Design a protein around this ligand. Structure first.
Ligand code: NA
Ligand code: NA
Ligand code: NA
Lengths: 379, 384
C-alpha cells in the first residue's frame, strides 16, 4: 500500500473490509489462468490489442533531432488507454460475483470506458458526475447513456469531480456486496493504485518488445502525460528497472504554472490526504486544463514516489503548447491526438530538438482527438 | 475492366491516357515485393491492422439463434475501413512519382481518409466537395483542415457530389503527371473498381483466417452494408470461391423501399452509365438519375459498384435493404449489448444480421462486417 511516503488506505472502518476483500480477490485472480485467459481474450478480440508502435518519420524530420515513436493507445477500442483498466476491473468484479459497477468521472472519459466494459460483461453501470462537468461534456454523457449506463448528476458541493468521488464512496459503503467501485486512474486507497497500474502495464510491455524489434534497443526517453497518472504508469512500469531509460511525466500547465489555472499537482501541489491516499494535491484548490482528462486535482502516489527518488522527471506544458502539438501531429502524421496526449507530444517535440538523431523517444499517445474537435474548433 | 456485363471505362479520351498509365503502374506494383512491404508496414504500424474478429456473445444469446461475429473495421485508424484503400492508393501514387492527391467526397468520410493518408505520406491533398455537402458535414471539413488538406467547395451546378466529381476529373486531366485521383469506393471507370476491391480484400483475408482459428470452419453467412460497395467487396472477395458461404449485401432502405427516399440501387435502381461505369443507379419514371436518401451518410449514394451488379446477376450474393428506423435500433442495440457504438452505415448490416440470426440455429455462424465506429454519428443520433 505504500510507495515510500505516499499511498495508504485512508477510509472509514466500513470500507476496510470491502478493500481487504478486493485485495484478497486481486491477489488470487492476477496470476490465475482462467482470469488471464479471459482478460487477454477481451483485450485482443474486443479492445484490439496489441496497439502498434509507430515511427513518426515526418515529425522526427521536421524537428530535426531524436527519433520520435508513438505508442498508439489512440487505436484501442473507445479511443483511450482507459479501456485496458475498465476491462480488467470489470472482469475482476464479475468473477468476484458483483452485478454492478460504479465510477466517478470529470471528463466523462472514464465514465465511457466503464460504461463500455459494463455493457460488454453484462453489468449494471451507474456513473457519478458533477453537474458542472455534465454541462461541459454533453456528448460523453450521451455516449454513456447509449452504452446503457445511468449517469447520476451530483448536485452537492462544487458539483465537480471532487463531489462525484464523495457520492461514489458513499454509494460503495452501502452497496459493496454486489457493486464494484471502478477507479479510473492510479489513485484512491490501496489496492487501487497498484491494480490500475498493473492493468495498464500491458502498454509498456508491448512498447518494450516493439521498440526492441524496431530499433534493437530501449528508448533514451519515455514521455507520457499525467493526470492521475495511469497511462504514464502503464508505459513507465516495465522500464523502471532499466536504469538508462529516462521517464518524463507531463502535467497540465494550463494558463501557466504561476497563473493559478493548471493541474500540475507534482509541480505545485502540497502533500496531503484525499480520495483515500497520501499524495500531492493542489491547495483544496480546483484545477484547470484545456485537456478534460488532465483536470484531476491530485496525482497517483507511485508518481509522487518516482519523483521523490528521482527515477522520473515531471514537467508541465501549457494549454497553448498542447493546442500547437494537436495541430502539428494532425497535419504532419495524419493522427489527431487527444488533447491530453498532445501535452506529451508538445514536450517530446521540445526534448527531441535538443537530442541527437540516433537517440530515441517513445511518446505514449494515450488517446485520439475526435472527442476534442469542438474544443479545438473554438480555441 | 468488366464484371460480367458491368463496369467498363466510359470516359472521354482525355481520361484514357491517365487511366492507362494508372492501370500499367498498378499491374506492376500490385505483386511487387517493395510496394507490398511498405503497404503492410503502414497498415500495421499506422492503421493498426489486423483488426480483430469479435464474437458478440451477449447479442448472440439475446437473439437466440446463430453465432454473430463482428469483423472490427471500426478499430482501424480513423474509425472506418476507408483507410485501407486511402493508404493503398496514396502509396501507389507516391511510388508512381505523384506528389499530390485529389478526391471527391459527399459525406466527407472518404475526404478524411484521403486527408489522413496524404498527411502520412507527405503529399498535398485537395478535396472537392459540393457546397451543399460542405454545409451538412462541417466537422469532417474541419477534420480535413486539421489533417492539412485543402477542401475546395464546388459552388457551380447543383452544388453536390456530381459537381465535385466533374471538378475532380477536370483537375486530374490537367495534373495527372503529378496528381493521383483517389476514388473512395468500388466505383468509377476501370481500373478503380478492381484497385479499391483489391486494397479492401485484406478485410476478408483476415476474417477468413480469424474465423478458421476461432471456429474451425468458414461462416454460413457474411453480412456487409453496401454504399458504393467497397467494405462489402473487401470482406466478400476472398470467400467468392467458397461456394457454401452465403454473401448478403445490405443497402440503405431509408424511409422505405416504396417511399421514394432510399439508396437501394441494386433492389430498386435500374441499369445506367455514370462516373465512367456501367452499373445500377436510382432512376425516376422519366429515366433520369434521382437523388438517394439514408440516415447513414456513407450509404446516401444513388449508385453501386459494378462487381456487386455482377454478383447479383449470377446470384452469388443476395442484396437486401434495411430502413433508417431498423438501423437506428441496431445502433442502440449493439451499443448497450456489446459496448460497441457502430457507424450508422454498419448498423444496417447489424440490423439485417439480427433478423437473419433469429431464423438460424445456434451452431451456425454469421460474420458482420462492422465497417466503422459511430463517434462521427452521435450528433444526428441525438437529434433523431
Ligand atoms: Na491491433
Ligand atoms: Na493533476
Ligand atoms: Na447505393
Amino acid at each position: 500500500m505504500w510507495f515510500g511516503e505516499f499511498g495508504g488506505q485512508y477510509v472509514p472502518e466500513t470500507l476496510v473490509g470491502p478493500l481487504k476483500e478486493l485485495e484478497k480477490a486481486y491477489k488470487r485472480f492476477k496470476d490465475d489462468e482462467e482470469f488471464n485467459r479471459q482478460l487477454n481474450y477481451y483485450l485482443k478480440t474486443w479492445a484490439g490489442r496489441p496497439t502498434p508502435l509507430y515511427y513518426a518519420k515526418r515529425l522526427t524530420e521536421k524537428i530535426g533531432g531524436a527519433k520520435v515513436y508513438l505508442k498508439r493507445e489512440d487505436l484501442v477500442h473507445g479511443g483511450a488507454h482507459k479501456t485496458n483498466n475498465a476491462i480488467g476491473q470489470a472482469l475482476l468484479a464479475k468473477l468476484m460475483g458483483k452485478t454492478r459497477l460504479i465510477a466517478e468521472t470529470g471528463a466523462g472519459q472514464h465514465g465511457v470506458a466503464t460504461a463500455m466494459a459494463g455493457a460488454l460483461l453484462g453489468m449494471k453501470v451507474d456513473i457519478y458526475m458533477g453537474a458542472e462537468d455534465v454541462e461541459r461534456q454533453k456528448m460523453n454523457v450521451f455516449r454513456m447513456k447509449l452504452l446503457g449506463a445511468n449517469v447520476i448528476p451530483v448536485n452537492s458541493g462544487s458539483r465537480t469531480l471532487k463531489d462525484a468521488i464523495n457520492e461514489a464512496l458513499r454509494d460503495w459503503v452501502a452497496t459493496f456486496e454486489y457493486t464494484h467501485y471502478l477507479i479510473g486512474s492510479v489513485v484512491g486507497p490501496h489496492p487501487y493504485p497498484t491494480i490500475v497500474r498493473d492493468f495498464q502495464s500491458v502498454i509498456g510491455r508491448e512498447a518494450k518488445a516493439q521498440i526492441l524489434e524496431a530499433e534493437g534497443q530501449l528508448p533514451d526517453v519515455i514521455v507520457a502525460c499525467v493526470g492521475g497518472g495511469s497511462n504514464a504508469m502503464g508505459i513507465f512500469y516495465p522500464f523502471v528497472n532499466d536504469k538508462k531509460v529516462k521517464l518524463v511525466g507531463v502535467e497540465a500547465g494550463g494558463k501557466g504554472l504561476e497563473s493559478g489555472k493548471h493541474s500540475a499537482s507534482l509541480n505545485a501541489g502540497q502533500v496531503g490526504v484525499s480520495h483515500g491516499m497520501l499524495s500531492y494535491f493542489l491547495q483544496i484548490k480546483p484545477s484547470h486544463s484545456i485537456a478534460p482528462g488532465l483536470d484531476y486535482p491530485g496525482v497517483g502516489p507511485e508518481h509522487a514516489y518516482l519523483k521523490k527518488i528521482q527515477r522520473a522527471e515531471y514537467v508541465a506544458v501549457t494549454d497553448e503548447e498542447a493546442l500547437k502539438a494537436f495541430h502539428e501531429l494532425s497535419r504532419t502524421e495524419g493522427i489527431i491526438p487527444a488533447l491530453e496526449s498532445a501535452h506529451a507530444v508538445a514536450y517530446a517535440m521540445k526534448l527531441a530538438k535538443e537530442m541527437s538523431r540516433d537517440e530515441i523517444i517513445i511518446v505514449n499517445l494515450s488517446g485520439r482527438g475526435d472527442k476534442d474537435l469542438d474544443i479545438v474548433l473554438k480555441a
